[PDB]
Amino acid sequence: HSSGLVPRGSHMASMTLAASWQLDNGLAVRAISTPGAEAAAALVRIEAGSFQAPAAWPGLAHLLEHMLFRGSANFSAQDGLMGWTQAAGGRLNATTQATQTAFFFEVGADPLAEGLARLSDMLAAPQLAAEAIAQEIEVIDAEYRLLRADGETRCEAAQRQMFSGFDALHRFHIGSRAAFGSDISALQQALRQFHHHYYRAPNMTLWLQGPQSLEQLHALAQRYGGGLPSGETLPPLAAGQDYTLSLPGAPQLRLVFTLPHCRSRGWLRRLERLLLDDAPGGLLARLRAHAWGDAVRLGYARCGENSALLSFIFTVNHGSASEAAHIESALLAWLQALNALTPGQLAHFGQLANRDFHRLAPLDQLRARALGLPPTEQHDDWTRQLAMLMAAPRRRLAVLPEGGGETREIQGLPLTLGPFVGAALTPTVEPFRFFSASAALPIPPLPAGQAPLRHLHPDEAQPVLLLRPSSHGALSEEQACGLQAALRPEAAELAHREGHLSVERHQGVWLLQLAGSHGLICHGLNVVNRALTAQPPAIINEAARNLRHAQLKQQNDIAIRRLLAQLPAALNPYWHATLVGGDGELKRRLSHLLYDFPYAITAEPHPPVTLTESGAEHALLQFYPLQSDEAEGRWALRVLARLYAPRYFQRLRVERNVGYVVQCTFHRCTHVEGLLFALQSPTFTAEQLRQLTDEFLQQMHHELTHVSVGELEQTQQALQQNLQRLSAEPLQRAREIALENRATIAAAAPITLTQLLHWQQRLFVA
Amino acid sequence: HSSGLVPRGSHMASMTLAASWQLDNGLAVRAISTPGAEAAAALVRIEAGSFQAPAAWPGLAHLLEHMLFRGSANFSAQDGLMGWTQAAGGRLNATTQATQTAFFFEVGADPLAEGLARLSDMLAAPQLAAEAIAQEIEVIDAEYRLLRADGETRCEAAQRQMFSGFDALHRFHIGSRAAFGSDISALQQALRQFHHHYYRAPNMTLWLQGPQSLEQLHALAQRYGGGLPSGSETLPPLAAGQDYTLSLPGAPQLRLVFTLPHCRSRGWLRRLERLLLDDAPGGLLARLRAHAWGDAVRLGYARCGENSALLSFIFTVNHGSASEAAHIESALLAWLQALNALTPGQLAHFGQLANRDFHRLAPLDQLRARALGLPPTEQHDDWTRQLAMLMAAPRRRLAVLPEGGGETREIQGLPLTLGPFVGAALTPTVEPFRFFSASAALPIPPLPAGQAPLRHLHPDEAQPVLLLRPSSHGALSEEQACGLQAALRPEAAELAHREGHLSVERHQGVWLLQLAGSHGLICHGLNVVNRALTAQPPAIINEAARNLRHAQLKQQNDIAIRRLLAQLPAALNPYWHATLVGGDGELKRRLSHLLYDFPYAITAEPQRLHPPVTLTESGAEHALLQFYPLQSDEAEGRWALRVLARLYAPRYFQRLRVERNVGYVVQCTFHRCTHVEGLLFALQSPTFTAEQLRQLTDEFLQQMHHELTHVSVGELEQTQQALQQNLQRLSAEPLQRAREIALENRATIAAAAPITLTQLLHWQQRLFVA
Ligand SMILES: [Zn+2]
């Protein structure tokens, strides 16, 4: 027995903390305190969506969402949450779904009260000015014309067509000039009645997440949540027909199960993490090995208080009938396999799934809690969930370029629906297998040869190896897809051992990234050399299907995103290697193992771009790069961006309705920093958009002289506060050290308006 | 629809992360990364306890637990975990339970690998030397004789007597000179078969928690957990038997014991506990106190086998009459039925409140809870099914009274005076319980015209804390203190739901009223403190009297060395002083006005030396307790004291506990008592006398008088660099952080650091020669 008498002084860990409340008005509150965090975020969810709009007002809810950003009893639209977030360099978005609606933002810690002040106000007392309604009728009709051509929007309408239950399921919900009406006065009282009936506190939930303490978060809830007003069932979905949908693009198989909507939905996040696992033995490895398919994602959509659709969305290869039957047969057997997961496997994959979640940004964590997949809990009723789903009614949507039927107006969208030509399911008897025990990491042999290696922040912890091609074009598009296909099994294995391996584009720059312990990078780099040398023909084929899918996906994007895709190639055989962290002996063993990397490793040693599109949509992407390498410039470009961005949006989006995409931002692309302008319009031509951007630049030429030195100091403090702090997670942190060089920049701060005005004109005149 | 094109680049929040693995060898690993934490901790739990010892070797497990801290293949007892935790100033302990055993430590972050090295080595390859066995038989037999006088040990033996199911339940498990026997080489073969059978990786779970990344913790778990043995039993559930009355000195108790399946999710028990211990009006404690049926409760949970547990509700009662016991059971059953009605919002509020108390624990204690106690709550845990499982479970009653009849008998090697349970009838229907649901806004209190003084450190800084403390030790009686607690305890629980804090607690000898929260909250709470504390109804003064007598009886039934620590503040020695630590000038000034109506005169804080204190006990236990106060209050002084204590602490332990078994309690530690800092020595022995123990401490101070000059400058530089890192950090929680600022003065203590040997020994002189 212990020989101690008095306990040693003890200091608590200071971890994440949660708390739940119900205000006296009926608002539910969920606070999450994350000490030390950079960002704070908030989200209000309302229990009403599209399905709750009156049958006579299609898209009423969509319109209400737009209009809440158009001014409230204590804030005009500019001083409201939209304009305040933009000045602040925050994030902000909202979503109207079938049965629920949500509004949410992300800012720095301190200005949280001001943000909730405005979120609370727009939710409680929107102006709903007839004049604003008139404007947003046009904005939605534009979004409606654009949505008539969107693959996902039409896929989701098609999926709902596979089920029945109630009228709203198959209604039009986007809205349109036709549907909103000529009587702007009767539209505005429909809005007021919807808002008055559903935007009550007993019908809302507020999530709060920031570095603030639970006590500070409670007070903000009481203060801003207390100022919301105080004061009906859908039947469940029944399975109908399978279908085929004809759409341009890579073919899909979407298996859609109709499920009850349970309170405990974290199991679905663990299911997602297993479904998306690339490891050998899993579902994706099997589909690729047989060239049945290449990717999957999970859709979950609540359709009512006790009714939901869960959709497994496969990108497939041939789109043939026997392909679909093999895929569905594989999914049902894999779901069976998941019954055998041991407690340790459920915990391992469950907490793997939750750390994918904790790595999202606050805004996106709150989104997932409110409308997406919650965090996993280790004592859910896993096998009871599994048995619910495998028995749930399920229908199949094949999406194909040629599919049959003729186009038809369904839910206000053009849907070409034809019968599903299915083959018989053939039992999948081959066993699936999943990670369980992690063995000791092999110790690779070192080559005698040796390649050059940059080593930064030596002998610091959490080492990261970054391998990148010399330039844009030193690695081809088809080679990347070959890299990703071959390393995908192995990166999955490394993720269980807590290593990271990825091959991804980061701001136009292909990076191979390797991180973990010292053993992990050594073993992993060895695995990379072998996986990429003798490439079996499955993986060449898969790489060719992935590239085809990537091309088809691009041709079917909206033009402004397609123009952004085209920016890297408009701005422009050896690789470079940089190790960030780790000791000297790590640097040297990696030096040897890099010699067996299949590509030679060498040691590391633009005028404005205008892109346009014409036709059914008009788009302008203007990139004004900074020619210099100076610290004072790259600082000024960021201060300029921050001052320009809210002005650009307010002038061209809210005042004049130039189009649905309106954005001026700082952007880095293939190591070139510069200012980005983006516009896409249904009416104005690309050249008309370039004219209005030039007009905005001329405006800024004379307006920034007059910026209150109050506004400038607050802007240069705010951006030095965002920027001096390197990232937490070491992959983002390793790029910021090796590539972006955030450190050297807040160095040149602050500066005078004379120096800023100087950098302005150097940037936007020839 | 959104008008953006490119995503704004964002940084993740750097929160807590968790991961689980299984090594090739079968070890389960559960990691928790706590970025920025000061401490790291590790626990290994082994699926074997006392019930698993062979019937022929009473106490084999207890001995194995003692003998694993006596050296292993790569580490002596001094270089091993015990001595190494002592050096680095960390925490260490172990527990053998009915069917499970755990070893765990807590240290600073960086040296975690060193501790895993030692922990791994002692779990895998203990020496188990005969000379140390025979030596440890003595320590345990002394622990046996002491435990035959422990109230809780005997209570836990009586509870098992109310159940049946398998032989080990009622066996003797402490061990004794008698039970261990004279054939020491046969004892050593028994240990080693026990170890070699149960101490293998497939039977072990490793918990690690620190500021390290998940990838680092994973690497450490591989390195040290992979060096554990490889290569790969049930007990039947428990039947209810008899109720009992157990006769023991001390405040009467009632213990209601439910026999349960041992399920895999037990976090619902932590929510039940948060509800059980809630002082709010409408709940269970408030009802017992309003009727003077009893004054406290706690929850016990004991795994007994793979699908058998005992859950025990342990009430400190008032009178202990048959009628009182039946009122308390009637209330508990009604209350458990009340918890059925909790809404999902109430389940989420109390479950997360519960987890917040879990997260206030130190790393070491979180790991203990996970492995052996109440895990964290999960918000979708079939609450009503587990409540329905509990309300349908067989249950038995143990009244514990100072005189209960029957006559002593030897049961589980313990003296137990079991009597029949005198049982009244339940009260057929009884009043409804109610629980917090909605939080209304907080009342704004009105100011008085008067005004009081109030310092104000760290102005206009967030998370303010109001500390009211009496002027000295005799400014508030141990009677009024118990009356303050009884009047605020209701009001403190309600502020806890709104996330403020209100406490009247003794902090290192200093009574302290603490209030923390928003500015609105402190004002409201301070106003409530005044109203609740002005006029106390006889109910509240009775409650205080019951609580005072309970404190007295607990004290005079504790182990001697603990009773002497309780006397140290008295042996060292009516207005109040007001401090605010954070907040506006307007907070300070309105607080200033609201303090005028504090029923005790507040004054401004004013601005001597104490000889050493020797406390002693003689009788069946012999205990000595010496506090050598530092008599100045210079910085270099209050630093040197902390260096010495760090240097002394393992030396005191290695010589007196290990090298000479001088007793089962042995400790040298810096200590701080009613504002006096100093060095504290504590010893308790079943053979040496208090004056003989004083002699070894006298002797020990001379060894360091000479030996201290000869300390490797690297060990001193190292000792001051670990001291300085830990000390310069101010606490996370704002209350501790408030005390450290406004009382302890932690910042100043390290201003003087480092120090050279000449004034370290200069300070050692003043402390002990005078
Ligand atoms: Zn012991």
Ligand SMILES: [Zn+2]
């Ligand atoms: Zn829209």
